[PDB]
Motif scaffolding. Structure first.
Motif, short mmCIF file in Angstrom:
data_model
loop_
_atom_site.label_atom_id
_atom_site.label_comp_id
_atom_site.label_asym_id
_atom_site.label_seq_id
_atom_site.Cartn_x
_atom_site.Cartn_y
_atom_site.Cartn_z
N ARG B 54 0.81 -1.20 0.00
CA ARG B 54 0.00 0.00 0.00
C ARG B 54 0.86 1.27 0.00
O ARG B 54 0.62 2.18 -0.79
CB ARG B 54 -0.98 0.01 1.18
CG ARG B 54 -2.18 -0.92 1.00
CD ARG B 54 -2.71 -0.86 -0.43
NE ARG B 54 -3.16 0.48 -0.82
CZ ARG B 54 -3.44 0.84 -2.07
NH1 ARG B 54 -3.34 -0.03 -3.06
NH2 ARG B 54 -3.85 2.08 -2.32
N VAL B 55 1.87 1.33 0.86
CA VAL B 55 2.73 2.50 0.93
C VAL B 55 3.48 2.72 -0.38
O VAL B 55 3.54 3.83 -0.90
CB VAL B 55 3.75 2.43 2.10
CG1 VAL B 55 4.67 3.65 2.07
CG2 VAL B 55 3.03 2.34 3.45
N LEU B 56 4.06 1.65 -0.91
CA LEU B 56 4.77 1.73 -2.19
C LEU B 56 3.84 2.19 -3.32
O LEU B 56 4.24 2.99 -4.17
CB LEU B 56 5.41 0.37 -2.53
CG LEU B 56 6.43 0.40 -3.67
CD1 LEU B 56 7.54 1.38 -3.35
CD2 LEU B 56 6.98 -1.00 -3.94
N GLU B 57 2.61 1.70 -3.32
CA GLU B 57 1.65 2.09 -4.34
C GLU B 57 1.36 3.58 -4.22
O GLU B 57 1.27 4.30 -5.22
CB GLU B 57 0.36 1.28 -4.22
CG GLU B 57 -0.73 1.67 -5.20
CD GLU B 57 -0.29 1.54 -6.65
OE1 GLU B 57 -0.21 0.39 -7.15
OE2 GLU B 57 -0.03 2.58 -7.29
N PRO B 64 5.55 11.88 -3.70
CA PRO B 64 5.75 12.98 -2.77
C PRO B 64 7.24 13.28 -2.68
O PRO B 64 8.04 12.39 -2.98
CB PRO B 64 5.23 12.41 -1.45
CG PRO B 64 5.52 10.94 -1.56
CD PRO B 64 5.40 10.58 -3.02
N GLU B 65 7.59 14.50 -2.29
CA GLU B 65 8.98 14.88 -2.03
C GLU B 65 9.49 14.28 -0.72
O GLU B 65 10.69 14.23 -0.49
CB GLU B 65 9.09 16.41 -1.93
CG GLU B 65 9.12 17.14 -3.26
CD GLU B 65 7.83 17.00 -4.03
OE1 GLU B 65 6.85 17.70 -3.68
OE2 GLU B 65 7.80 16.20 -5.00
N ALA B 66 8.56 13.87 0.14
CA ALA B 66 8.92 13.44 1.48
C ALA B 66 7.89 12.49 2.07
O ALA B 66 6.69 12.60 1.79
CB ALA B 66 9.10 14.66 2.41
N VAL B 67 8.37 11.56 2.89
CA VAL B 67 7.52 10.73 3.74
C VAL B 67 7.72 11.16 5.19
O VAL B 67 8.85 11.25 5.67
CB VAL B 67 7.87 9.23 3.64
CG1 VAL B 67 7.07 8.43 4.65
CG2 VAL B 67 7.60 8.70 2.25
N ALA B 68 6.62 11.42 5.89
CA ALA B 68 6.70 11.83 7.28
C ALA B 68 5.99 10.81 8.14
O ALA B 68 4.86 10.41 7.85
CB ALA B 68 6.08 13.22 7.47
N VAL B 69 6.66 10.37 9.20
CA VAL B 69 6.13 9.33 10.07
C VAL B 69 6.11 9.81 11.53
O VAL B 69 7.02 10.51 11.98
CB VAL B 69 6.97 8.04 9.98
CG1 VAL B 69 7.03 7.53 8.55
CG2 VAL B 69 8.37 8.26 10.53
N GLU B 70 5.07 9.43 12.27
CA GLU B 70 5.01 9.76 13.69
C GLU B 70 6.07 8.94 14.41
O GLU B 70 6.11 7.73 14.24
CB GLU B 70 3.63 9.44 14.26
CG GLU B 70 3.31 10.14 15.58
CD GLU B 70 1.84 10.01 15.95
OE1 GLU B 70 0.98 10.41 15.14
OE2 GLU B 70 1.55 9.51 17.05
N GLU B 88 12.59 1.93 -1.68
CA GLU B 88 12.42 1.49 -3.07
C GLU B 88 11.96 2.64 -3.95
O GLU B 88 12.33 2.72 -5.11
CB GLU B 88 11.44 0.31 -3.15
CG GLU B 88 11.89 -0.93 -2.36
CD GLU B 88 10.77 -1.91 -2.13
OE1 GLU B 88 9.74 -1.51 -1.56
OE2 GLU B 88 10.90 -3.08 -2.53
N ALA B 89 11.18 3.56 -3.37
CA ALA B 89 10.65 4.68 -4.13
C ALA B 89 11.63 5.86 -4.21
O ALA B 89 11.41 6.81 -4.97
CB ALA B 89 9.31 5.12 -3.58
N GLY B 90 12.72 5.79 -3.45
CA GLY B 90 13.72 6.85 -3.48
C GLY B 90 13.23 8.12 -2.80
O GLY B 90 13.62 9.23 -3.17
N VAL B 91 12.36 7.97 -1.80
CA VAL B 91 11.79 9.11 -1.09
C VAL B 91 12.35 9.26 0.33
O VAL B 91 12.26 8.33 1.13
CB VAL B 91 10.26 9.01 -0.99
CG1 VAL B 91 9.71 10.15 -0.13
CG2 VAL B 91 9.62 9.05 -2.38
#
Lengths: 157, 157
Positions: B54-57, B64-70, B88-91
């Motif tokens: 799901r995240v990769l999809e 997005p330019e960025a992934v932000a996680v709590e 894998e997505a290079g983010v």
């Protein structure tokens, strides 16, 4: 009235709940919309089991008066899971095909899907047409049922 | 700028994408919001594998330019899957804790969660506060990152 609509799908199962107004032109509010997404790598029993668990959770939480489903073997599996959930929740099931949805929401049997999606966006007051198509379909089926329920031609599966 | 926010959870994993305006008071539009829901009966590898898929999809589709996680073992599993997808997505991945989210969106470190949720509803222009909490959290984390990105104090994990 509160209606769950479901669109049994390939790798997505659209599942939505709407509350429809009792008077005036067909008008509803979106209470819930989700898509059960399945993967190729997960086994069949998990795919079908999750569908069951999600539908049952939605029926128990939202207590709709009706479940509405759009109208082959594997799609049959998904609908199987849906049917089990409705049976456990004590909720009656009604089935409608693409043509009835088009007729109810667009006023002709051969309307384009885009016309149905425009009406669903209209009736639910959404900013944009609800994405993805399996969710848009499930909401349309729900609203289709409410339409025929009003005028008393609901088709119980 | 376009940001994915993620809230690693117990049985729900909040996953949202927002596009934030470049000038003016913090303002964004919701591009995507979903919750990956896992069941007790499905094995651990499926739960974590689906999260990954799901995240990769979402990253591939929304770029997005960025992934932000709590910001323990099993939650760690979910975040593991998330991290793999970003790799894998290079983010690039940025992490923020509850206090930073509260500070960025409510203006004090000890604000109540309801205050954060009110601001997320405000900033995204939503009718109602985004439900459920894991989704609301993931959007807040996304918007938190955009806030610190603007003023150049992004915290890269």
């Amino acid at each position: 009235m509160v209606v769950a609509g479901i669109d049994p799908g390939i790798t997505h199962l659209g599942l939505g709940v709407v509350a429809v107004e009792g008077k005036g032109a067909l008008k509803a509010r979106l209470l819930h919309g989700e898509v059960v997404k399945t993967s190729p790598q997960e086994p069949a029993k998990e795919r079908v089991g999750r569908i069951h668990a999600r539908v049952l959770e939605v029926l128990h939480r939202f207590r709709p008066e009706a479940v509405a489903v759009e109208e082959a073997y594997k799609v049959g599996w998904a609908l199987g899971a849906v049917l089990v959930a409705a049976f456990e929740a004590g909720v009656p099931v009604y089935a409608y095909g693409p043509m009835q949805v088009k007729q109810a929401l667009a006023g002709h049997g051969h309307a384009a899907k885009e016309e149905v999606a425009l009406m669903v966006r209209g009736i639910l007051g959404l900013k944009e047409a609800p994405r993805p198509s399996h969710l848009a379909n499930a909401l349309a089926i729900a609203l289709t049922h409410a339409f025929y329920a009003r005028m008393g031609t609901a088709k119980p599966l």
